[PDB]
Structures are given as structure tokens and as C-alpha cells.
Symmetry: D2
Subunit: 250 residues, 4 copies
């Protein structure tokens, strides 16, 4: 259907937002590789969506540079030329800038920023100039648009992804690469991980935070990623797609 012929890598694809992206990608006809760090979880997640003819799990840590080349080779071996890269893997640190230790800072940025860099750079190299309608979708958060006093390192990583993606988009467009790069900026989304933090959903559902008075669900982010992966969005590049319940509109 809407993603006919697409082959997608979805990092952090075994839980929450990434899992829903993979689910709707398969529903729309794409073949998907979802990555994660734990194999006992990752395989049941893939099977929860489809069989190995449409979706497969590959253990990969987004900060693992060499593993990225291996991840692409495995995906192409399974499904053919990669067309779509969703850089979704990330981690959080609940600290102000003042209270962030240098170890927390470096570890978060090696996943949230270096990992997105590794996936974007390689995706451009492996997908340019092949008539694929290639699309790189970088998950860049409402925390890439506004600050949060207790997400200092996360804010830095998401702001970096936001503008680095415009650089990539412009270079691909100017060089007729047939690769588009866009960022998605989710507001608060209900996941089992948000569930395990007592008070988190309640805090984020305050009207002063999310004007809709509730947080979203993973499918809310999947559907905008479907649009961005499909050729329906062949004129969209370097842009920010915000699905946040009004959070940044006030």
C-alpha cells in the first residue's frame, strides 16, 4: 500500500514509539528491521507484528559505529536495498544542566547524537543516487524545540539532531541524491516506560504542559512517520513535524 517497496531500519524499534512505527510500516507494505539491545525482547516484538518475511529484529546499539555498516548489510541481505532510516533510539537523563555529570552527558550524547549522526551519514552514503525515494526520519522531540529545566543533556542532543538534519537535507537536495531528511518532534507519549515512572503521565497531562489534557499514544508518531517515509512527502525535506497535543503552541 502506502510504503510499497520500502525497506526500513527502525532503531529502538522493539518498544513504544519505535515499535508502533515498525507496526504501521509493515501494515503499509514496507519490510522492516527493528533494532534493540536485548534479543529475548526484540524477537517477540518482531513476531508480534509479522513473520520474518516482513519484519526482523537485529541486536544493535545505536552508538556502535561499526555495527551500523553491519546492520545495513544484514538488512539488505534480508530485504534488498535500504530505502528508509528512522533514527529513533535514545536515552533520557533526568538532570538539569547544572546537575548533569560528565559521564551522564557523554553517554546520552553518544546514543542520542552520535547514533543519529552515524545512521544519517551512512544512510546518505548507502541510499543516494539509486532512485529509491529514500527518506531519513530523525526523532528530535519537542525537547529539540523548547528547553526543559531537568532535561539539559537531552535538550542538547535533540537540538543538535534538529539542525544537523537540516544540513543533511540541504546537501542531499542540492546534490540531487534522491534522499530526504526530516525531523519528527513528539510531545509526551504514553509508553510502558512512562508508565513505570510514577506521576509522569499525570505531570505531562497538566493543561500547562499538554493543552489537550492527555498524552498521546505511539500510533500518533507512527502515522506521521508513514507519511514521511512514503513518496507522498517527496517535496518535504529539512522540515520539522510536530505531534505534541499543542505543547509547543503555547
Amino acid at each position: 500500500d502506502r510504503l510499497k517497496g520500502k525497506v526500513a531500519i527502525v532503531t529502538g524499534g522493539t518498544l513504544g514509539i519505535g515499535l508502533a512505527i515498525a507496526d504501521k510500516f509493515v501494515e503499509e507494505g514496507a519490510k522492516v528491521v527493528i533494532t534493540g539491545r536485548h534479543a529475548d525482547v526484540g524477537e517477540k516484538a518482531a513476531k508480534s507484528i509479522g513473520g520474518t518475511d516482513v519484519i526482523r529484529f537485529v541486536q544493535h546499539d545505536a552508538s556502535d559505529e561499526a555495527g551500523w555498516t553491519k546492520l545495513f548489510d544484514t538488512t539488505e541481505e534480508a530485504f534488498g536495498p535500504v530505502t528508509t532510516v528512522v533514527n529513533n533510539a535514545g536515552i533520557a537523563v533526568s538532570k538539569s544542566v547544572e546537575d548533569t555529570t560528565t559521564e551522564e552527558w557523554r553517554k546520552l550524547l553518544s546514543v542520542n547524537l552520535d547514533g543519529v549522526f552515524f545512521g544519517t551519514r551512512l544512510g546518505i552514503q548507502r541510499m543516494k543516487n539509486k532512485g529509491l525515494g529514500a527518506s531519513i526520519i530523525n526523532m528530535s522531540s519537542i525537547e529539540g524545540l523548547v528547553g526543559d529545566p531537568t532535561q539539559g543533556a537531552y535538550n542538547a542532543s535533540k537540538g543538535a539532531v534538529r539542525i544537523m538534519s537540516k544540513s543533511a537535507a540541504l546537501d542531499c537536495a542540492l546534490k540531487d541524491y534522491d534522499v530526504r531528511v526530516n525531523t519528527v518532534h513528539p510531545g509526551p507519549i504514553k509508553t510502558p516506560l512512562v508508565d513505570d515512572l510514577e506521576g509522569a503521565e499525570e505531570m505531562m497531562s497538566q493543561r500547562t504542559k499538554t493543552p489537550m489534557g492527555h498524552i498521546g499514544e505511539p500510533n500518533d508518531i507512527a502515522w506521521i512517520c508513514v507519511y514521511l517515509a512514503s513518496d507522498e512527502s517527496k517535496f518535504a525535506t529539512g522540515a520539522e513535524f510536530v505531534v505534541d497535543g499543542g505543547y509547543t503552541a503555547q
Copy 2:
């Protein structure tokens, strides 16, 4: 399966160009559509080019005509049932710097591009709130609502106004649990017979210093993002700006 099943849409300025493509893809996705425009022969031919009166109808209406807006909703509702979707797309251009803009040009453009969008948004909230329709208002606000252009002063004013007024509406609807979303769409240069009739226009906007992709878009590029915004797929998106511009604003 149809992504706009059961939706009922008004698309102003929907007989040519971007509005016509939005109407076409809306019908294709299962919506019933009323398109508006000022000229009846163009408008009737436009509607029939998309489908029969069971899925699409033309209503003659100038978007700056405040009184006509209530009749337009009534006509749409009697044909298709309650309106769920309003695309405020009607708009005109003035090729003048702020310095060179006449007061008559200023007022005429703003009466369509700003007053009209206000009339449709205000009435849309009134008529669609609290009805469980998954209502969506889509305001066309242009890259000229994000960046300035030295020779588009009044257009820039109108589109910046639509951009932020739409956030006001989105927030009020959300805080009041109205079940109405309001978002803006920001097209870059798009090929239309309007652009084709202006010699060198497509060539100027295709320069890499304007559009990095080196070409201008097509009306269906805007239609597809409007389908996303009209559908229940985007039920968590409100008050946000959706930019389809070939990279224009990213540099």
C-alpha cells in the same frame, strides 16, 4: 481502506491549483467535499472533473464574504451532513514591497487572506465543536508565513497572521475539549497554471538559492499533507506548522 471515511470537508478556493488537488485527494480518500470559488463555470467544471454530486459539489463563494460563510456551511450540511473539516485555502497575491503597497491593495489582500481565514475558522469552531466528529481546521499559511520576501509585504503580513491566529484557535479548542484541531500548512513554490501563466516564475523559484531541490512542487504535494491533517491519524497534532517546501526554509 479510506483514510477520510465519513469526513465532510469545505475547501475554499478549491477549483484550481492546490485547493483542487486537496479536494481531489479528499474525495479519493472517502470524504464528501464542497469546493468554493468566485467563478461558476470554472467551479462547476472543477467539481465534475473529480466526481459526481454524491461526493463533491461547487458553491460560489468569496471567502471574504462573511454572510456567505454561514450559508456555505448550511449548504454543505444539507448535502452531506455536518461539516467535519475546513480547509481555508482561498488566497490572493500582491507583487509589491511593503514600501510600494497601496492601501487598497493591502486591504483587498487581507480581506481574503486574513479576514476570510478568520471567518472560516471562527465559524468552523462554532459549528463543529462538541460533536465527536474529529473535526480539523487546516489553514494554508505558506512559507511566506515563516520567512519574509522583499516583494510580498502584504502577503507576508496575512500569512504570519494566519500562522499565529491558528495557534490561538488550536489552544482554545484543546483546553475546552472541543474535539477540533487547528493546524497550518506552509507550501513552498508549487506548480499551478497560475504559476505557468507568469513567465519565468517557475524558473526563478527553481534556483537553488530559492528551492534547494532545484524544482518547484506539485499540487498533490500539498494534498497529501492535508489528508494526514484531516484524518484521525493526526488526532494528537494541533497548533503545529507543516512545511512542504523543497528545503526552502531550511537554509
Copy 3:
């Protein structure tokens, strides 16, 4: 009196109260000659005298939505002080209505001042200040409400988003044509002024930490000082930009 605006001649619309008064006050303190406008001659004459004598500041009764009066206002100012170098389009009004609840009368009245007035002053300011080596500067008063929405200020939001982007168009045309005129926008957050004071509950609502992270609203001098920077030749490379002084309001 010091000298960061030496030789400048400024029109400050709505300069008899609140933010406009503070702009005029600090402009005079920095060496500028100033004409303030307003609709009430009694408040306005006293406002000007409260800042200085007629050799540094004068009041002119003018509604900013009155197009023909704009030409007379420039003539009167240049007759008094020489060619105008600086236009601060500050006059503005508010309406506490959602988009849904805004009447068309309220919509047109607010926009005739907040948008048409800024257009009239920007258009005429370009015509009368271009190509004169003045280091000219047009400062258009937007608001944080030109950057984010407010559910109960629909028309005001529209007017301030219009000012924000129209000003960019004017700045670009002036720059590309070497007019020696800059155009920038100032976006105050909540500021203690009569506009705020006489909206019951407004300061209290805006002082909440969920609104202004600094936990209080600003004061008129906060906006005067960024305007002094923008009117001075210190900002000669600044054009088409948005200057936000808002207590952190738009950072979260």
C-alpha cells in the same frame, strides 16, 4: 543625558503610557529627540513634559490607524527636530476574546490599530528615511503573542504574527536596495503597564511559573533598553530579527 542615540530623531507611537513612555524616556536620556503620539491630548502633553522640554520631546495627537495623519506627523516631527531617523511602531490594543468569541467589529478595530497602524508607519518610514545616510531604524512592537498562541487573545495573536513577518519583508527590501534602513521586531513578554493593569487578573495569571519562569512580569524599562540598542548604530548589522525579552516565557 548621555549619547548612544546622538543625532537620532524618533517617532514613538503610543508613547504617552507604559512601554512607549519608557522608550521615549530612555531615548531622550541617550540623546535622541522624540515625538510621542497618543489619542488623548491631556495625558499626552503631560507625558512629554514629564520627560523633558520641547527642545527634546514633543507630543502629537494622532491615532495610529489614521493614515493621512501619518504624513502630517512626519512633517510635524521633521519641522521640529530635522529628518526622522527612527520609527517605533508601539501603539497597540488588546481584546480578551477567543477566536470563536471574537466579533467582527472587535477584529477589525484591533487590527486597524495593531496591524494597519504598523503598516502605515513602516511604509511611510521607509519612504521618508531611505537613502539619506541616517542610520535609520524601524522598530515594530510585536509580542510573545507573535510567537506563541493565547487561547483568549485571538485577534491580538493575528495582529502580532502579522507584524512579525511583515517586518521581515520590509527589512529584506531595505537591505537588498541599500536604503540604510533596518527593520526589527521586539517581542516583550508580560510587562506591568496600564494595558495589563486594567485586565483583571492578568498580572497574576502571567506571573505564574508555568507562564513566566522568572515568577514575575517585567517593567517598561526592560523594553526601552532593547529598543535603545535597536535604534543605535551599535545594531547596524541587525535586521529582520526578533528580539525577545520575556522572562523565559517562550523558552519552555
Copy 4:
């Protein structure tokens, strides 16, 4: 007199933009410590501005975390408690995202991002709750607002600075630290950084790039920094100050 009583650290204050900031800060009454890696350049720069009663040089690489603590100690010993931190040190790499080596990425980010994090975190720690009218000014760029196809790592670093600074501003404000944090976004400015990239001034002077048709001068950035360091800006925090010749207005 506009900076009477202020004590400022200006990283990379020995050439270009940072030198002009230091110069104007001293003119307005501040005591200033400038940093840089090269003591030959730095000692002369300090002497070109004033005597050791108003300005001193400290050899320090902004990417050196341990050195930041020494730098604040040295400044305190000379001039009293620091009131103003200008995180200005930065470098550039003329590579698209596709063409960026991981070494180039890590080197630029360790200076442009880690260094701004180190100085912001330390500035907050050292200046909070002292009633100093403290101000942290983080040097971003128009390249933290828009992309550039050939400055991918730089774009990443400047977008990170932009949004991390908002987080810091918010935390300082909500906690009543009496510390403001803002970012400055220069457009092209004539500096050794620009003068060494051959053809860069000519490129950035095109009207399609800078509408004013010329690039700026270091004093253009000095004056907005004076405003931000002074108590004139006591209501300005978390905001972006753009001095760019119209670059980002089109």
C-alpha cells in the same frame, strides 16, 4: 560604565569576535579574563586591551574540563567572583554530514558543545545565589537556526548550544538563581575563522546569503553581548539574539 562591577570570562577571547567582546567589556567597566590555547597570541591580546588591573589571559582549551575549574579559581583570585561567562570558543569543519569523519565530528563537538556545557554548568555552580546579576552568553550561530550543506558537525554543535541554553535559563529562573542564560546567533563576521576559509567572505557576501551584501564585523557581536551582560537585560533569559545582516529573515 554599563558593565560596572562585572567580572567576565570570555573563552576564545584572543582573536576575532571574542577579542572584540573583551575589548568592549573592558571599555564598559568590566574586569575580563580571556582564554585561548596559544599564549603567544593571548598575552599580546590582553596587553592590546589593557593592564592586568582590567584584563588577564589564561591559557585554556575549552574542551579541557579540569582546566575550567582552574580558570574560575584564577579569575576569582584576580578580580573577585565571576559574574559573566561568554562561551565563545569554537571551531569549524568544512564537511557535509556525509563527508564528516568521526574524528572531525568528535573534535569539533568536544570544543563547540562540551566546552559550552562545561562553562555553562560551572558558571551556574559558581554564580548561583550570589545576587550578582549573573549572565551566561552562549555563542551559537545562524547555523544553529538554519542548516548549511557543508558544515554538518558545526550545525549539530550550534543547534545543541541553542536548546541546551534554554534548559539552563529555565532552571536558573525557576530556582531564583539570579543567573540568566541567552544565546547569540551571529551571521557571517569578518574574523580569522572566516579569513582562513578561502572564498568564504565572498560567498557569504552574496545577497542570496546576506541580504545586506557584506559580512559583519566583530564589534557587531560585541555590542549585543554588552547588552546581555548588563543589568539592562534583567528580563531577558532563554532567548536567541540574532545579528546576521538579514541572513535568516529570508
